[PDB]
Coordinates of C-alpha atoms and ligand atoms in Angstrom, one line a residue:
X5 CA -15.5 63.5 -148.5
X6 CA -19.1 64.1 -150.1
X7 CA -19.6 67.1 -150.9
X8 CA -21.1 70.2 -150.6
X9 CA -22.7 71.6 -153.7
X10 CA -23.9 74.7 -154.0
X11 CA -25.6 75.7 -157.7
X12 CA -27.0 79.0 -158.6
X13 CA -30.1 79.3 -161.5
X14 CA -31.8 81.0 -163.3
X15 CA -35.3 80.6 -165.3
X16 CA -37.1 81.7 -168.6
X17 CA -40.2 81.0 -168.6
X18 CA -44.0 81.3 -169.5
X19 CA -46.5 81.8 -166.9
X20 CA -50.4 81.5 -167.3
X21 CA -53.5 81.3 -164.9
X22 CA -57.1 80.9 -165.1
X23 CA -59.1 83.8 -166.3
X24 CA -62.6 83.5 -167.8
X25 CA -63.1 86.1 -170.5
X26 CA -61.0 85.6 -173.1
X27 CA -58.1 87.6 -172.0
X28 CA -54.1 87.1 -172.4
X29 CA -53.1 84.4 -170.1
X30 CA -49.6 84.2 -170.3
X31 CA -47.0 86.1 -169.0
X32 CA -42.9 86.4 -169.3
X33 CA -41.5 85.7 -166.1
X34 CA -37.7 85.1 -164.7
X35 CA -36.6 83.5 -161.1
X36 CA -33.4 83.4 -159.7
X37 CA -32.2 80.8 -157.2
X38 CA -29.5 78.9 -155.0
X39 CA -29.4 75.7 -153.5
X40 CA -26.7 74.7 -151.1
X41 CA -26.7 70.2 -150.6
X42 CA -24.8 69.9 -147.3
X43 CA -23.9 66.6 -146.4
X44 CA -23.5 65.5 -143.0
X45 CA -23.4 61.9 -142.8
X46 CA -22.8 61.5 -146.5
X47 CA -25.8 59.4 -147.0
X48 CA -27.8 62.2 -145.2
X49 CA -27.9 65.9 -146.0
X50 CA -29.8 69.4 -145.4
X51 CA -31.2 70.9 -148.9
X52 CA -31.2 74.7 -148.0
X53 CA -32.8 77.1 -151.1
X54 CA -33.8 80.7 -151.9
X55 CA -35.5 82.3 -154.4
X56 CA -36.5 85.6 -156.1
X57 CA -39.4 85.7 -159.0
X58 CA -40.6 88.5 -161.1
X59 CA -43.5 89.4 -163.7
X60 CA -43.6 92.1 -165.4
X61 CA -47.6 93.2 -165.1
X62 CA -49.4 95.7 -167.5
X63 CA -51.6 98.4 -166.1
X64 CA -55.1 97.6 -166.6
X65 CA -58.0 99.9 -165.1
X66 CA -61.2 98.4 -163.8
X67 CA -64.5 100.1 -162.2
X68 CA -65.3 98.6 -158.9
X69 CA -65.4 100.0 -155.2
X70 CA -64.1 98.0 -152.3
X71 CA -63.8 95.5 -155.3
X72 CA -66.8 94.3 -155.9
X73 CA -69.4 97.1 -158.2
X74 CA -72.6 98.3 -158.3
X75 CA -74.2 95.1 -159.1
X76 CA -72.9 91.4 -157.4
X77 CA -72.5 88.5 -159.9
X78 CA -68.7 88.4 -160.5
X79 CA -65.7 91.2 -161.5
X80 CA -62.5 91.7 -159.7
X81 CA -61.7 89.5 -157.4
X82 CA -58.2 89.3 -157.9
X83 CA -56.1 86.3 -158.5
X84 CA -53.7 85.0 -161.3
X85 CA -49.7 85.2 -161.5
X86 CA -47.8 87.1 -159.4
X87 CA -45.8 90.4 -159.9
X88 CA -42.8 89.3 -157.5
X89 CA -42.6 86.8 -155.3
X90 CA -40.1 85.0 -152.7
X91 CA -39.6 81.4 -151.5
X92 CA -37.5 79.4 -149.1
X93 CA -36.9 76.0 -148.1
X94 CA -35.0 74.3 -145.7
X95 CA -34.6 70.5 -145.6
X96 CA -33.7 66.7 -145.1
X97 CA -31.9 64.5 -147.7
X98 CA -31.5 61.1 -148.9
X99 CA -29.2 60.0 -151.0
X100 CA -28.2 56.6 -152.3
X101 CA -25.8 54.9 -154.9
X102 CA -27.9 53.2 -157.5
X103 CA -24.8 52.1 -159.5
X104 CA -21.0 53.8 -160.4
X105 CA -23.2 55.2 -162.9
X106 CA -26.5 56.6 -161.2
X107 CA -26.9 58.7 -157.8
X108 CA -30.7 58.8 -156.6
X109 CA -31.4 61.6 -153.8
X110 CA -35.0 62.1 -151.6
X111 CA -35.5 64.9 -149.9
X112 CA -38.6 66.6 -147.9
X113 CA -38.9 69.4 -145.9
X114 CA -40.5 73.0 -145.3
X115 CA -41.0 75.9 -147.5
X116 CA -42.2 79.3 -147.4
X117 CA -43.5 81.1 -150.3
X118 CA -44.9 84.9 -150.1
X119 CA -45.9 86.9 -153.3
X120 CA -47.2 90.2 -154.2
X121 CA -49.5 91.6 -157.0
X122 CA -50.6 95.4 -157.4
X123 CA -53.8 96.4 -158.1
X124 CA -55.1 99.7 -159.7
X125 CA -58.7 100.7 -160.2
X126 CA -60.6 103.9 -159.7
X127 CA -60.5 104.7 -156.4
X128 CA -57.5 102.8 -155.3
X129 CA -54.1 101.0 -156.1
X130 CA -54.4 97.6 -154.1
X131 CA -52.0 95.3 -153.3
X132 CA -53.1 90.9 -152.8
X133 CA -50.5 88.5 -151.2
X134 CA -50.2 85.1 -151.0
X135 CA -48.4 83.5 -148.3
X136 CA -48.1 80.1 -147.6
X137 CA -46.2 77.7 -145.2
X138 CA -45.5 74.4 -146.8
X139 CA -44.6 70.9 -147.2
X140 CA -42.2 69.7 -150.1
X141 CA -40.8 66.3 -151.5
X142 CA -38.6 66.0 -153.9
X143 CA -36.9 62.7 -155.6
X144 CA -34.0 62.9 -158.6
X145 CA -31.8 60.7 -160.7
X146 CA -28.1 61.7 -161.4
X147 CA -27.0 59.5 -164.4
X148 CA -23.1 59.6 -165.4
X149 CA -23.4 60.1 -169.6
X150 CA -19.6 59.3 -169.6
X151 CA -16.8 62.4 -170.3
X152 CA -17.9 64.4 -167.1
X153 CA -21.7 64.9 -169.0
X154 CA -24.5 64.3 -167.4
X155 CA -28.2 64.1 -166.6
X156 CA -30.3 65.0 -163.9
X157 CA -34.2 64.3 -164.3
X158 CA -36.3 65.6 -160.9
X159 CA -39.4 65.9 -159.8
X160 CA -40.8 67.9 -156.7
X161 CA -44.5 67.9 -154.7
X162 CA -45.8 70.6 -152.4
X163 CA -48.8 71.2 -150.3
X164 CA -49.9 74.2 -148.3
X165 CA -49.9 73.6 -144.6
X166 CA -51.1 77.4 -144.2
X167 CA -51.9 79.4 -147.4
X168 CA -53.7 82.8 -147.2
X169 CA -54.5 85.3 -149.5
X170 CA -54.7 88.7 -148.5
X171 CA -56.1 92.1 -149.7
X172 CA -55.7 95.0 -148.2
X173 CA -59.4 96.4 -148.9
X174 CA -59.7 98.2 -145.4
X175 CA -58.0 100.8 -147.6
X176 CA -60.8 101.0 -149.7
X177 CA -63.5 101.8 -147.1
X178 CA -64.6 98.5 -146.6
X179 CA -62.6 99.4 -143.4
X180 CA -61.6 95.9 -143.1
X181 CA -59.0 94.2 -144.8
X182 CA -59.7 90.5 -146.5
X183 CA -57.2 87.6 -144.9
X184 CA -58.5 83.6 -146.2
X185 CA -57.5 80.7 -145.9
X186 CA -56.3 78.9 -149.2
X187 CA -54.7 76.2 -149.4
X188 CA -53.5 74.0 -152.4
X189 CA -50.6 72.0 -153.5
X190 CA -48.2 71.8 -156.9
X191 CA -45.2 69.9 -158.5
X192 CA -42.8 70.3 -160.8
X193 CA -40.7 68.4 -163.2
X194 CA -37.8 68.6 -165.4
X195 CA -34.1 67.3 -166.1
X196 CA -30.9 68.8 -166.3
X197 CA -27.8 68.4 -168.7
X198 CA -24.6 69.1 -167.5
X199 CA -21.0 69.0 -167.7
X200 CA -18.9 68.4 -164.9
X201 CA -15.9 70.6 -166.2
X202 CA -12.8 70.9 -163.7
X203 CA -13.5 69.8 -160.3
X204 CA -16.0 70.9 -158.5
X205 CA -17.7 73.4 -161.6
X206 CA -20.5 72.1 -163.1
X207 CA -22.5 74.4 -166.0
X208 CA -25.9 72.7 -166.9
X209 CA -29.2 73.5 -168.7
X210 CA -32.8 71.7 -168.9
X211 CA -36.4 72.2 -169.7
X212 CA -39.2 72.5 -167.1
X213 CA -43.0 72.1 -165.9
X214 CA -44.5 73.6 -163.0
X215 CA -48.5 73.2 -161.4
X216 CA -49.2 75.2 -158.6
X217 CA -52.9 75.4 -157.5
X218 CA -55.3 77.2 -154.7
X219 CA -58.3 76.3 -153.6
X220 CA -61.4 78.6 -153.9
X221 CA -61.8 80.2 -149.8
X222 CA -64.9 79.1 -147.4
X223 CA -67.3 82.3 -147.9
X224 CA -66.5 85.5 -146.4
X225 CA -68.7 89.0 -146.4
X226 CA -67.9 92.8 -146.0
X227 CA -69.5 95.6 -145.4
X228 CA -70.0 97.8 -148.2
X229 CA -71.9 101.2 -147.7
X230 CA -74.6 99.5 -149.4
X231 CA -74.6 96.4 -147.9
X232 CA -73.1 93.1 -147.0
X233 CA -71.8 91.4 -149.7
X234 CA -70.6 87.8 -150.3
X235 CA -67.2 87.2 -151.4
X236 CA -65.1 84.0 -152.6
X237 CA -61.6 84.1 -153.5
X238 CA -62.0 81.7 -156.9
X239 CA -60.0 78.6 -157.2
X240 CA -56.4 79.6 -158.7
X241 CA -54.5 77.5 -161.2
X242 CA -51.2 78.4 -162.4
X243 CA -49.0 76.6 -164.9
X244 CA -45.1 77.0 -165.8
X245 CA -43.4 76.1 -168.7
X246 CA -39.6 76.9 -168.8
X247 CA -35.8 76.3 -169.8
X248 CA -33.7 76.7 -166.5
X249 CA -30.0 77.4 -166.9
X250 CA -27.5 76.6 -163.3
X251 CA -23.4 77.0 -162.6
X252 CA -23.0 74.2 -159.8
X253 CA -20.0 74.9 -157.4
Ligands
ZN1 ZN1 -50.7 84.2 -174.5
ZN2 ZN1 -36.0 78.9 -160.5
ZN3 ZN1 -63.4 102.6 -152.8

């Protein structure tokens, strides 16, 4: 007698990080999703969601060894968008009547993200990962346009609890693989138009922004067959611009 909505989505969107030389920053990139709002004392609710990204990424060769070359200054050291990645998120809800005309919803809980990237040079084809345990709150408007139409601006803030990026380098005779600590924090915004059509179906589309940074890691060495050598996983910022498209059951 409230109730439960589940929507499925899909993105388009462009993806770019923070490279230093000039190169192509964005990328194409497509996520797939479902949320299920499940009411249980219709003020209060659990927010469950899952989701599957991909990139595509272009084969590009570098020469380094463990990943780091001949000389130290700076060249790998592997960060920027992702080639697939997964999140979840399980949660608490809010929700209050503003008005017959306007719905306003709250929401925090936990999420899990994990992503992959592969990388090719010389010697080897490594893979980096980024997995991260976080916190998430979100906070929406749902405004009544009359005729069933609607609109639904939203906004969303994460920070890591427990973010590390990993490299499995112990396959490149560094015989140790790297594991650091990285946290950061993002949001996102954006709104929605929809149409309620027919009980229950709803078909909406909307425009939207996401931020999602990581913090440079403490210092770390290896061991290289010519030394020791220091290492710092460089700050990562990654921006999202995109048009989000969602059938809501
Ligand atoms: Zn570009
Ligand atoms: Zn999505
Ligand atoms: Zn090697």
């Amino acid at each position: 007698q409230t109730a439960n909505e589940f929507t499925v989505h899909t993105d388009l969107s462009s993806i770019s990080s923070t490279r230093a030389f000039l190169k192509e920053k964005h990328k194409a990139a497509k996520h797939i999703g479902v949320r299920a709002d499940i009411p249980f004392d219709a003020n209060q609710g659990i927010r469950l969601e899952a989701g599957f990204g991909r990139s595509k990424k272009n084969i590009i060769n570098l020469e380094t060894d463990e990943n780091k070359l001949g000389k130290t200054k700076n060249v790998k050291l592997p960060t920027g968008v992702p080639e697939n990645r997964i999140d979840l998120y399980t949660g608490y809800t809010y929700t209050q009547t503003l008005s017959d005309s306007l719905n306003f919803r709250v929401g925090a809980g936990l999420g899990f993200e994990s992503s992959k990237d592969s990388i090719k040079t010389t010697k080897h084809t490594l893979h980096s990962s980024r997995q991260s345990w976080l916190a998430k709150v979100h906070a929406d408007l749902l405004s009544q346009l009359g005729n069933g139409w609607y609109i639904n601006p939203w906004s969303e803030v994460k920070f890591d609890l427990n973010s590390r990026y990993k490299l499995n380098t112990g396959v490149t005779n560094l015989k140790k693989d790297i594991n650091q600590k990285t946290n950061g924090w993002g949001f996102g915004l954006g709104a929605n138009i929809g149409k309620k059509l027919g009980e229950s179906a709803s078909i909406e589309a909307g425009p939207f922004y996401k931020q999602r940074t990581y913090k440079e890691s403490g210092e770390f060495s290896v061991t290289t067959k010519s030394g020791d050598v220091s290492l710092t996983i460089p700050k990562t910022s990654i921006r999202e611009y995109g048009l989000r498209v969602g059938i809501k059951f």
